[PDB]
Each structure stands twice: as structure tokens, then as C-alpha cells.
Design a protein around this ligand. Structure first.
Ligand SMILES: COc1nc2ccc([C@@](O)(c3ccc(C(F)(F)F)nc3)c3cncn3C)cc2c(Cl)c1Cc1ccc(-n2cccn2)cc1
Ligand SMILES: COc1nc2ccc([C@@](O)(c3ccc(C(F)(F)F)nc3)c3cncn3C)cc2c(Cl)c1Cc1ccc(-n2cccn2)cc1
Lengths: 209, 209
């Protein structure tokens, strides 16, 4: 048990050190909503200006997820190729999961570049259905009321997936995965939160949306 | 006249050396249309996989545009800051103009990753309005039947624009711009193609769409 409970600890600690934006900081800024003047400024930008801003933010978020993977006990031991495949396959899946921390379901806003704004903040993109899916996915995830410890373990499971294609040493990913799934269960039962397992999004929904 | 005509030559030669994809190779591949199986494969990908694909292709195209600017006589002489502002302001405008070369208006398809596909190739993006704009813009530009020499001069004009905000040494951009506009006119007149000037897209349309 001290084995599993130490895995839960190092996973959470690794998440703490790589969460990029602390939860308490995002909640303290909730009342800081973008004004209409500021929304129009975003809407007046060009399609390339908004596409490039979001690409930058996502690329920077992936780096933090790379560090999260680096500090998962056992991930560094996996072969180089398996490290690339797992990251390229699930890094952005973890970023989108992390994005729900920046989402406020009370008013349906998201933290972005200093303040909270709705979907209309991203109109210049021309990706209203994509953005709608991101808001909708975050809204459905917010209804789980994830703790930071639950996001730490859940995101680690999203990353360490033995089924990804291209994995050469599957069985050594299977081991690192089962330990994480069991750690997930131990922490959930010790906090009376096992009822959210049947509510998590399917492995497939994380992507196509 | 040998002064203007040599500017037309070095601009076209610079375009030739930086066109990335040669026109003859794009035309030779027009009959190579994506099959339905291959279209579904693109439509089954994840939102992040397609966004990541397109982002990579666009970034790589910008690099070629950077080289096109480097070889425009006088551009290197401009100050460092003015080089950054001009490129950041018009590099993607030149990429989108160049994209019409990969567009076939006979069947409304575009070359992408080895074959020609319609707008339904990008459905997984969730950016139907944006993509619709790239197709519509390319279709309107295809009706001009640009020669490669005309794209060389026109794109150089799109890049060298004295009106861009942030330009410190405007008058030295004005000089390099006037020479290019006059070169544009000389080549169009000597080829009886001056009638396309009244048909070019406005300076603003190149962006927001
Ligand atoms: C709703 O649309 C978005 N919402 C976002 C909300 C937060 C952040 C975030 O990166 C951030 C960090 C720091 C600051 C700063 F600087 F202000 F503090 N601002 C923002 C952040 C904070 N915690 C985690 N993340 C990731 C970025 C967002 C982005 Cl990029 C978009 C656009 C977008 C999203 C997804 C795809 N996509 C394409 C394919 C799949 N998905 C495309 C575009
Ligand atoms: C219609 O949608 C697209 N059509 C494209 C057609 C061609 C290419 C191209 O880069 C290329 C090169 C090599 C190969 C390969 F691999 F086959 F050789 N394939 C393709 C290319 C060839 N000549 C010039 N270019 C640029 C890329 C395309 C892209 Cl990215 C899109 C998506 C898209 C378009 C625009 C924005 N955007 C965001 C803000 C504003 N605009 C976003 C996404």
C-alpha cells in the first residue's frame, strides 16, 4: 500500500510542479471578465493573428505536459520511441483536460491571456464549431468537480496508454499503466469519490469531438 | 528601362528559387485525386491531429516566404525591425496567395499532402468557415490566371508595403515599393496583362476574410 500511496504522491507532486497555472490563481481571477472593448479587439484581429496566438499558447502548454511526463516514475525508463509516441498521442489530450481548470461553469467563461471571456473571444479564428466543442467538453468535465489530485492521476492515465499505436515495448507500458489505474482507484475510494469513474469521458471522445 | 527590367528579372528569379512547390509538378498531379477511403481517413482524425498538420504545413510555407523576402533587392538593407514587421504583417498573406497555385478551379480541389482534395478533407478541423474562406479566396484568385512571373511581382508587392504599422524608416520602404509597383506595371504592359489590376483583391481582403 505504501507502494501505491507513494505513486499517488509522486504523481500529484509531479502535477503540482508542472500545472503551469495554479488553481487558486485561476479562481481568484474569475471576477476579472474581459470588457466589450477588449472582446472587440480580439474580434478585429486577423485570422492569422488569432490562429498564431492560440498555436503559441497550446505549444507552450504541451511543454508543461512534457515535463509532467518526464517526472512520472517509470516514464523516463521507457524507450525513446515509446516516449515520443505516448507524448505525441496524448500530450494535447492532457492539455484539453487541464483547460477545464480555466473554465467557469457559473457563467460559461474561460481564462485566456489575463481575463475571462466567452466563445465570442475567438471569433477571428473561424473555428466556431471547434471552440464550441472545447467549451462543451470543458463544461461536461467541470460537472465532475475534479480535485487537483484527481486531475493529476487522471491526466497521467490519459498519457500512459498501452493501446497507442507504434508502441514497441507494450508490456512495460502496461505495467506502468496498471499501477496508475490502481493508484487512481485507491485514491478515489479513500476519498469516497469512486462514483465519478462511471462518469468519465470515453477514451475516444478526448480527440475527435 | 534596363533598371526596371532587371528588377523584374531578379524578383522573378528570386520567386523561382523559393516557390517551394513548382507549378509544373502541381499541374502534373491534378488527376491524382484523393479517394473516398482517404477522405474518410482525414475525416476520422482528431481535432488536434488536423490542426497540428495544417499548422506544420503553414509554418513551413512561411519559411520559404522569409527566403523570398531575403532575396528581394533592398529588403536586406532595411533595418532589422522593419524586416520583422513587414514579414510578420505579410508573410502569411503571401502564403495564402501562393496557395492558389495548388488550387484547381475546374473541380474545386486543392493539393494537400500528395493528392488533390476538396473542402471536405478538412472537416475534422472544426473550422468550416475559415476553410470555406481559403477555398473561396483561392477560387476568386484563380480566375485571374496568374502567371508565375505575375505571382512573383504581386507577392513582392504584398510583402513590401509602406503602410504597415510599426515601420520606422517608411521612406526607404516607399522607395523599394515604388520600384516594385512600377516593375509590376512594366511587365504587365509588355505582356498585355494590365487589365488584371482592376481585378486584384483589395489590400484588406487578404487578411480577415
Ligand atoms: C477556448 O479556446 C481556448 N481556450 C484556452 C484556454 C486556456 C489556454 C491556456 O493555454 C492559457 C494559459 C495561459 C494564459 C495566460 F497567458 F493568459 F495566462 N492564457 C491561456 C491554458 C491555461 N491552462 C491550460 N491552458 C491550455 C489556452 C486556450 C486556447 Cl489556446 C484556446 C484556443 C484553442 C483551444 C484548443 C484548440 N484545439 C485545436 C485542436 C484541439 N484543440 C485550438 C484553439
Ligand atoms: C485549404 O486548406 C488548406 N490548404 C492547403 C493547401 C496547400 C498547403 C501547402 O502548405 C502544402 C504544401 C505541401 C504539401 C505536401 F505535403 F503535399 F507536399 N501539401 C500542402 C501549400 C502548397 N503551396 C502552398 N501551400 C501553403 C497547405 C494548406 C493548408 Cl495548411 C490548408 C489548411 C489551412 C489553410 C489556412 C489556414 N489559415 C489559418 C489562418 C489563416 N489561414 C489554416 C489552415
Amino acid at each position: 500500500l505504501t507502494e501505491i500511496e507513494h505513486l499517488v504522491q509522486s504523481v500529484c507532486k509531479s502535477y503540482r510542479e508542472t500545472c503551469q497555472l495554479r488553481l487558486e490563481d485561476l479562481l481568484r481571477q474569475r471576477s476579472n471578465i474581459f470588457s466589450r472593448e477588449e472582446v472587440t479587439g480580439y474580434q478585429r484581429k486577423s485570422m492569422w493573428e488569432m490562429w498564431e496566438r492560440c498555436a503559441h499558447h497550446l505549444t507552450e502548454a504541451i511543454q508543461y505536459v512534457v515535463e509532467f511526463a518526464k517526472r512520472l516514475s517509470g516514464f523516463m525508463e521507457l524507450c525513446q520511441n515509446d516516449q515520443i509516441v505516448l507524448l505525441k498521442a496524448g500530450a494535447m489530450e492532457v492539455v484539453l483536460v487541464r483547460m477545464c481548470r480555466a473554465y467557469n461553469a457559473d457563467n460559461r467563461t474561460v481564462f485566456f491571456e489575463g481575463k475571462y471571456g466567452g466563445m465570442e473571444l475567438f471569433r477571428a479564428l473561424g473555428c466556431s464549431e471547434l471552440i464550441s466543442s472545447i467549451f462543451d467538453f470543458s463544461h461536461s468535465l467541470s460537472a465532475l468537480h475534479f480535485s487537483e489530485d484527481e486531475i493529476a492521476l487522471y491526466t497521467a492515465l490519459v498519457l500512459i496508454n498501452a493501446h497507442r499505436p507504434g508502441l514497441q515495448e507494450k508490456r512495460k507500458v502496461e505495467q506502468l499503466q496498471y499501477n496508475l489505474e490502481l493508484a487512481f482507484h485507491h485514491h478515489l475510494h479513500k476519498t469516497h469519490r469512486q462514483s465519478i469513474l462511471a462518469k468519465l469521458p470515453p477514451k475516444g471522445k478526448l480527440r475527435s469531438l
